[PDB]
Amino acid sequence: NKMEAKIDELINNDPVWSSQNESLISKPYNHILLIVQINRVMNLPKDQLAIVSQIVELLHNSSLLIDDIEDNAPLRRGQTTSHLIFGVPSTINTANYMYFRAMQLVSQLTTKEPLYHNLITIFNEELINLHRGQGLDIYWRDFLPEIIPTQEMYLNMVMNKTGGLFRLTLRLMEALSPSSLVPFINLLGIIYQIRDDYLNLKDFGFAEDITEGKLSFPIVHALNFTKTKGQTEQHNEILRILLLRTSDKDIKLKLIQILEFDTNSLAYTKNFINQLVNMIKN
C-alpha cells in the first residue's frame, strides 16, 4: 500500500539525480582540470564560442582520462593520474559520461534543424575517427611484434587519432562561422603528434612512451631502418626493450642511444618536423 504509492511516484517521474550525485560522479574529471585565434577567422558570437570551448574541453579532458588508463600512466600534468586516485572503474565511467555531456552541449549551439544535423554529424564522424586511430595505435602496441607499422601506416593512424579532435574543433567552428582550413589543421595535427613523440625522448620527461611500448614516429623509423639495413640484432634489441614495459631509466637511455647513434632516428624525426613546419611557414 504505502510501498505502491512510492513506486508509483518513482516510475511516473523522470529519474532522480541530485547536484550531490553530480559531484560524486565528477570527481575523476575535476581532478584533471587543474580556439580564440581560430575565431579571428571564424568570428563566432562569443555566445556560441563559449559552448564550443566547453565542448572541446570536455572531450579533450575526458579522452585524456581514458588515454591514461589505456597507457597505464602514473602522471599527467605533473600529478598522479585520476585512475590511480579514484580507481579505473569510476574513471572510465566518468570520462564516458562527459563524452555524452559534451554531445548534449551541441544542441545548445543551435536549434536550426539543418545546421544542427551538420554539427552532430561532424561530432559523430570525428569521434569515430578519434577512436579508430586510438584503437590502431593501441593495437600495434599491445600486439607487438605481430605488426610493425610503416611510416605511411603511422601517418594514417595520426590523421584518424590526432586529426580527430583538431578537425572536430575546426569543423564545428567553420560550420557556425557567420563569415576550408582542414588541410591546414590536419598538417598541424601531424606536426604536433610527431613533435610530441620526439620531445618524449629528447626531454629525457620520463620517456614514458618507452615504458608504454608505443610505436612512436622515431621508433617506427628505427625499426624499419634496422630491418632495411639487415641489422637483426639492433632491430631485435629495440623490440626487446619496448616489450619490457620498463621504468628503469638506464634501459630507457640504452634505447635512446640506439636511436641517436645507430639509426639516427632523432635527427631523422627533427628533419621531418622541419620539413612539415616549412610546408606551413612556406
Ligand X SMILES: CCCCCCCCC(O)(P(=O)(O)O)P(=O)(O)O
Taking CB under 8 A as the criterion, the residue among 64, 88, 244, 277 binding a second copy is 88
The answer to whether 196 contacts Mg ion (rule: CB under 5 A) is yes
The answer to whether 228 contacts a second copy (rule: CB under 8 A) is no
Identify what 59 binds: Mg ion, a second copy, ligand X, none; CB under 5 to 8 Å per kind. Answer: none
Sequence-separated contacts (24+) of 200-208 with Cβ below 8 Å: 201/256, 201/259, 201/266, 202/266, 204/252, 204/253, 204/256, 206/75, 206/247, 206/249, 206/252, 207/252, 207/256, 208/71, 208/73, 208/75
- Hey, which residues between 177 and 216 contact ligand X (CB under 6 A)? 193, 196
The answer to whether 254 contacts ligand X (rule: CB under 6 A) is no
Q: How many CB atoms lie within 10 A of CB 218?
A: 28
The answer to whether 8 contacts Mg ion (rule: CB under 5 A) is no
All cell numbers assigned to 205: 620527461
Cα→Cα distances 132→9, 78, 104, 128, 222, Å: 44, 28, 22, 6, 25
The answer to whether 274 contacts a second copy (rule: CB under 8 A) is no
All cell numbers assigned to 117: 544535423
Identify what 227 binds: Mg ion, ligand X, a second copy, none; CB under 5 to 8 Å per kind. Answer: none
The answer to whether 162 contacts ligand X (rule: CB under 6 A) is yes
Query: Cis (ω within 30 of 0) for the bond into 145?
Result: yes
Residue 197 in marked binding region: no
The answer to whether 66 contacts a second copy (rule: CB under 8 A) is yes
- Nearest approach in angstroms of CB 265 to a second copy is 16
- Nearest approach in angstroms of CB 33 to a second copy is 17
Residue 67 in marked binding region: yes
Taking CB under 6 A as the criterion, the residue among 49, 55, 130, 207 binding ligand X is 130
DSSP 259: I
The answer to whether 77 contacts Mg ion (rule: CB under 5 A) is no
Taking CB under 8 A as the criterion, the residue among 85, 100, 108, 248 binding a second copy is 100
Could you give phi then psi for residue 150, rounded to 5 degrees? -95, 175
Convert residues 97-116 into a mask of x (bound to ligand X by CB under 6 A) and - (unbound). --------------------
Q: Give the nearer residue to ligand X in terms of CB position, either 64 or 277.
A: 64
The answer to whether 97 contacts a second copy (rule: CB under 8 A) is yes
Residue 94 in marked binding region: no
Q: Give the nearer residue to a second copy in terms of CB position, either 146 or 203.
A: 146
Identify what 276 binds: a second copy, ligand X, Mg ion, none; CB under 5 to 8 Å per kind. Answer: a second copy
Show the beta-strand stretches assigned E in 103-227.
Answer: none
What angle is formed at CA 21 by the lines to CA 89 and CA 2, rounded to 5 degrees? 115
Could you tell me which of 113, 102, 125 has the C-alpha nearest to residue 52? 102
The answer to whether 165 contacts ligand X (rule: CB under 6 A) is yes
Q: Give the nearer residue to a second copy in terms of CB position, either 8 or 47.
A: 8
Q: How many CB atoms lie within 10 A of CB 162?
A: 24
Cα(180)–Cα(177) distance, integer angstroms: 11
Q: Which residues are annotated as a binding site for Mg(2+)?
A: 67, 71
